[PDB]
């Protein structure tokens, strides 16, 4: 509260570390469904069903232009990618399985990097 300061973690490396994590995401072989925005005019349903589209290229642009206030807002956008994927795609499908794989991949890197 006012003039009662909670000891804070060092966040000076967060931008670099998130950029590193995102690079590993972008280069994962199962990243292909997530590299670019879903094409809203070639994919029936998507615009109506998915209220907040998100993809790695959009996250990269936001990270490069100071649009994430903190690391948690970055992780929210990454998770949004996989939450959208689960909403729209069957688990069995190639895209659906890619999403599950990439979520698992991200969350381990997230824990290993920041839950130091």
UniProtKB/Swiss-Prot annotation:
Localized where? Nucleus
Function, as annotated, reads:
Regulatory subunit of the ATP-dependent BRF-1 and BRF-5 ISWI chromatin remodeling complexes, which form ordered nucleosome arrays on chromatin and facilitate access to DNA during DNA-templated processes such as DNA replication, transcription, and repair. Both complexes regulate the spacing of nucleosomes along the chromatin and have the ability to slide mononucleosomes to the center of a DNA template. The BRF-1 ISWI chromatin remodeling complex has a lower ATP hydrolysis rate than the BRF-5 ISWI chromatin remodeling complex.
Tissues expressing this chain: Expressed at varying levels in several tissues, whereas a smaller transcript was expressed specifically in testis.
Recorded protein name is Bromodomain adjacent to zinc finger domain protein 2B
- Subunit note: Component of the BRF-1 ISWI chromatin remodeling complex, at least composed of SMARCA1 and BAZ2B, which regulates the spacing of histone octamers on the DNA template to facilitate access to DNA. Within the BRF-1 ISWI chromatin remodeling complex interacts with SMARCA1; the interaction is direct. Component of the BRF-5 ISWI chromatin remodeling complex, at least composed of SMARCA5/SNF2H and BAZ2B, which regulates the spacing of histone octamers on the DNA template to facilitate access to DNA.
Disulfide bridge map = none
The Bromo domain, residue ranges: 9-113
Q: Which domain of life is it from?
A: Eukaryota
Family membership: Belongs to the WAL family.
């Amino acid at each position: 509260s006012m003039s009662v300061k909670k000891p804070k973690r060092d966040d000076s490396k967060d931008l670099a570390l998130c950029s590193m994590i995102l690079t590993e995401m972008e280069t994962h072989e199962d990243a292909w469904p997530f590299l670019l925005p879903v094409n809203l005019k070639l994919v029936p349903g998507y615009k109506k069903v998915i209220k907040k589209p998100m993809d790695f290229s959009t996250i990269r642009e936001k990270l490069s232009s100071g649009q994430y206030p903190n690391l948690e807002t970055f992780a929210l956008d990454v998770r949004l990618v996989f939450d959208n994927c689960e909403t729209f795609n069957e688990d069995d499908s190639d895209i659906g399985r890619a999403g599950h794989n990439m979520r698992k991949y991200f969350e381990k890197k997230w824990t290993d990097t920041f839950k130091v």
